[PDB]
Amino acid sequence: AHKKGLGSTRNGRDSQAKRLGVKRYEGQVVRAGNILVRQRGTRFKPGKNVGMGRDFTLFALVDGVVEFQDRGRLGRYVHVRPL
Amino acid sequence: RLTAYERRKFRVRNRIKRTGRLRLSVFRSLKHIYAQIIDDEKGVTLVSASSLALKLKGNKTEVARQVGRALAEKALALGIKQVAFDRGPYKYHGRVKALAEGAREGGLEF
């Protein structure tokens, strides 16, 4: 039974998924330190009471409630409103 | 299209407003110098001063220090002590610096 030799593919690699995206949505109660957005670059921008880490991670500075705001050409911001 | 003037003014103002303080904003014309302490969360000027209002004249720098003391004087009246200085498009120097030195001399905290 003839078996024809086969070549091979030079591909077949992919990197681990990074689980990026928003982690707390508008209206959710968060605690200072809570991660709000995992992102590459400033897809969202830190607004009121929100810090930004070296990898653009947005995180809450105070206990409170998350709020989003789309400022058009100024960009999308994530806020934390004090309780 | 922005000019270096507008880019500068945004550049320093963005950094100040991140700190959340009341903003002592200074505007300097060729004749007059104007100051107003601003709440950016409410969008309201809380207190102001200027050579035009105080009808002062003479040495622009010496007049700049005067409005500084005048702005501070009225500021302490309404409870305002801490504040962040907003040199906007201006170097921290001369007329702006004198107004800054004046406000501290009168008791504003910056």
Binding site: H2, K3, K4, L6, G7, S8, T9, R10, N11 | -
Partner: protein
């Protein structure tokens, strides 16, 4: 034969084939056209065959418009191989073609020359077709 001069990527995943044609459903250039009634991957060879047939009927005369282009790379593994070991090599190009598409148009010719030429062309095509004439519905689009 038609094919892209350059391409970002050598191999495309296989199409789906749902829905009426996206565009190119109205006669745009000539007087008469040839309309697809069923979907298909029309190969470059089919196109080139329908085109030559309309030339040899127009005996070099008239105008021929080809409004489909084979841009989709078509892949086939070498004979008798087993599955796997990556995607087969590109052996040809097809144009995705869905019901309602005007594939060819003609003009500069009599109504009898065009209806026959378009009829011969449809025999070169792996689908049913339908000959149309430029209406005002066309010119309103």
């Amino acid at each position: 034969m038609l094919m892209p001069r350059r391409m970002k990527y050598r191999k495309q995943q296989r199409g789906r084939l749902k829905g009426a044609t996206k565009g190119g459903d109205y006669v745009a250039f000539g007087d008469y056209g040839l309309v697809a009634l069923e979907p298909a991957w029309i190969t470059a060879q089919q196109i080139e065959a329908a085109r030559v047939a309309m030339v040899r009927h127009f005996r070099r005369g008239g105008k021929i418009f080809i409004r489909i282009f084979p841009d989709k790379p078509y892949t086939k593994k070498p004979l008798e191989v087993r599955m796997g070991k990556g995607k087969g090599n590109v052996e040809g190009y097809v144009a995705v073609v869905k019901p309602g598409r005007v594939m060819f148009e003609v003009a500069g010719v009599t109504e009898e020359q065009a209806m026959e030429a378009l009829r011969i062309a449809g025999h070169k095509l792996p689908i049913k077709t339908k000959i149309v004439r430029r209406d005002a519905y066309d010119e309103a689009q």
